[PDB]
Structure formats: structure tokens, C-alpha cells
Amino acid sequence: MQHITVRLPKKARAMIVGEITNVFKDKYPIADKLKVIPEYDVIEQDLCKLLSPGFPKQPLRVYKFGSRITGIGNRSSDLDLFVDIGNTFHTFEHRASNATVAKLRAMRKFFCDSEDWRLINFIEQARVPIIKTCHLPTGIECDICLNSMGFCNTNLLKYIFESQPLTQYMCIYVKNWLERCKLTEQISTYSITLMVIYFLQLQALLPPIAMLQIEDAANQAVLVGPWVVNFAQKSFSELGLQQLKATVPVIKGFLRNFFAYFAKFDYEHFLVCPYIGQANVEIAKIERMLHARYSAYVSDNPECSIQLKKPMVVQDPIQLNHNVTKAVTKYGLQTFVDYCQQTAELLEE
């Protein structure tokens, strides 16, 4: 029923009307602490010990990433691990290749046989196939992949969150909001993180990612396939962006404005575009605004262009052909919009 608002779930409502301090009192210090704990070194070492014998002629490196590493995790969060066997970091796979699937299938057996690991699921169909497994000595659930792109995203978020901590507080809040709204099947934590980033770029509080990726005499791209995955780690002082101290009042006001903005966004004509970082980025124009490697990649691979004929378009700022909200349905978008509207209303002073 499109003429009736979807009602905000009571689990979300109680948290929104509740003091925002309660949101963070335990959550931010926990998330900060979980960026680095000694358990992760045990996991990394155990993973290398387990898998190295099985790939004895190749270099092996483990890259940890995800919400724990960026600073928005909690004690139940999974740890994402990219296992790079044979210098595959710089190889881009739109859909996993046969050779990648074969490596993942071989790795599954190691976790299966090992007493130190419980195999939870082997997810082969996914866009990013993963092994979900529990590291039993620590009890931390680990998502093992063979794709470097999520790790690259994590390093960009770390820079963003460390430079402008308001972003981190906002992302902790909206992650919890998504969960209480029961929206995570359609809108991921990473998708709403990119929405927070884009919103703050419009406030001149974060740089466009394209700005951080100028290719000139002093700066060369790190490429994963056609994607530029590095960025200049410029101080915000040098970028001319102010660095705010996140207080409860500042956070609440930015959250109010965030939800109001996405309640009234025109998803039919515009996309959320942290690459460009400017207002009103048109769906009709975005593909002509990307770097030349995007055009060359899609020219050679026309089935791999960004999916724009979708209710909700949120573009990954590194993997520019990925609409991270491509699975949002018309009703799912209406639900999100209605929840944003009601949340902004409840955050008014």
C-alpha cells in the first residue's frame, strides 16, 4: 500500500526516542577498542599456518578488514579476512573465476579438517564467494574471501573515520538503526556507511574520493583491475576541511539532518555518489563522469556496467561499476524512506 506509511518498528523507535548518549555510552569505546586486539594476530597466524602447507609454492598474506577494523564493530561482529595466495591482490573479478572457486573449495577442506576451526557455511554462489568459519580458540567468526576489494574499502573508511570521527559515530548509530529496523537483508552496513559519507561530503566535511585520486607526476594509481584503490592520505588541514569534535548534540543534529535528507532524496533521478561527492549526481550522467578506465572496462565488458535501472543507486567509490543497493526493491526503498522520515521527526528538538 503505497499511500500508507510503513510504521517504524518499535525496537527502533525506543532507541531513537531514547537518549542518544545510551546509544554510544558503551558502543563507541567498544568499537574503538576492537580496531586492534591481540586475538586478531592469533587468527592471522593460525590462518597462515593452516593454509600455507596447502599452497607451498606461493606467497601467502592475510589482510583483515571489516567493521571491527574500521571502528564500528561490537563483540559479536565477524572478522573479514582476505587471504592472498600468489599475488592476486591486484586482480579484479566481477564474478569469481573458476580458478578462484577451485581455490576456495580447496580451502574449505582445511577448515573442515582442522580442530581449530568450525566450518559454518561455504557460500559459493555469492558475488564474493566466502568461507564462513569460527576460529575456535578466540570464538570470533571469520569470513574468508579471495578478493581484495573489501580490504581496500576498509582502508578508505579508516582514513575517513580517523580524519573526521563524527563519521564513525554516525555509522555506529545507523548500523544499529538498520538492525533494529530489520532492514539488513536489503541495505547493508556498508551501503549506509557510504550514505553517511556522501551526506557529509555535501556538508563540506569529507572530500570527494575522486579528489583524493588525482593521477599526476607525484601520485600514481594502485590498480585492482580497472579500479583505483589507493588515495592520497592528506590531512584535512591541507584539504581545507574542518575537523569537528563529535559531541552528543553535534551527533544528534547531523543524524536528524541525515535521515531528513534521505527521506526526501529523489532516488528516481539521482544516486548516492561518494566518488563525486557533490549534490544531485544524475543517474542519466554518471557513466560519462567516471575515469577512462571505467569506460574501457565496460566497453570490453558490456555486461559489467553499473546497475542503474534499480530503485536505489548507491555507487561504491572504488569499484565504480557496483551499485551496492542493487537488491533494494521498490517496497524496500519505500520502507527505508518511511523509516527515515519517522526517525528525523523523532530526533527534532
Numbering used by the authors: 201 to 549
Sentences reproduced from the published study:
Terminal uridylyl transferase (TUTase) is one type of enzyme that modifies RNA molecules by facilitating the post-transcriptional addition of uridyl ribonucleotides to their 3′ ends. Recent researches have reported that Drosophila TUTase, Tailor, exhibits an intrinsic preference for RNA substrates ending in 3′G, distinguishing it from any other known TUTases. Through this unique feature, Tailor plays a crucial role as the repressor in the biogenesis pathway of splicing-derived mirtron pre-miRNAs. The structure of Tailor contains two canonical globular domains separated by a large catalytic groove, which serves to accommodate the 3′ ends of the target RNAs for the post-transcriptional addition of uridyl ribonucleotides.
The overall architectures of Tailor in all models are almost identical and resemble the previously reported structures of the other TUTases, belonging to noncanonical nuclear poly(A) polymerase of the DNA polymerase β superfamily. The catalytic domain (CAT) of Tailor consists of a mixed five-stranded β-sheet (β1–β5 strands) packed tightly by two α-helices (h2 and h3) from one side, exhibiting a typical folding of the DNA polymerase β family enzyme. Three conserved catalytic aspartic acid residues (Asp278, Asp280 and Asp 343) sit closely with their side chains all pointing outward from the other side towards the groove. The central domain (CD) of Tailor, on the other hand, is made up of a long α-helix (h1) and a core region of six closely packed α-helices (h4–h9) which is a homologue to the central domain of PAP. The juxtaposed CAT and CD are physically connected through the linkers of h4–β5 and h1–h2. In addition, a highly conserved loop, which has been previously termed as nucleotide-recognition motif (NRM), also exists in the CD of Tailor. Although the overall structures of Tailor in apo and RNA-bound forms are highly similar, careful comparison did reveal a structural perturbation, upon the RNA binding, occurring on a region next to the exit of RNA-binding groove, which is mainly constituted by H294 and R295 from the loop connecting h2 and h3 (L23), R327 from SSL loop, as well as N521 and K525 from NRM loop. Specifically, in RNA-bound structures, the portion of L23 loop (H294 and R295) and SSL loop slightly shifted towards each other upon the RNA binding, forming a direct hydrogen bond between the side-chain of R295 from SSL and the main chain atom of Q325 from L23, which is not observable in the apo-form structure of Tailor. In addition, the side-chain of H294 forms two direct hydrogen bonding interactions with Q519 and N521 while H294 also forms three water-mediated hydrogen bonds with N347, Y500 and N521 using its main chain atoms, in both complex structures. All these H294-related hydrogen bonds were not observed in the apo-form structure of Tailor, reflecting a higher degree of rigidity for this region in the RNA-bound structures, which is consistent with its B-factor profiles in three models.
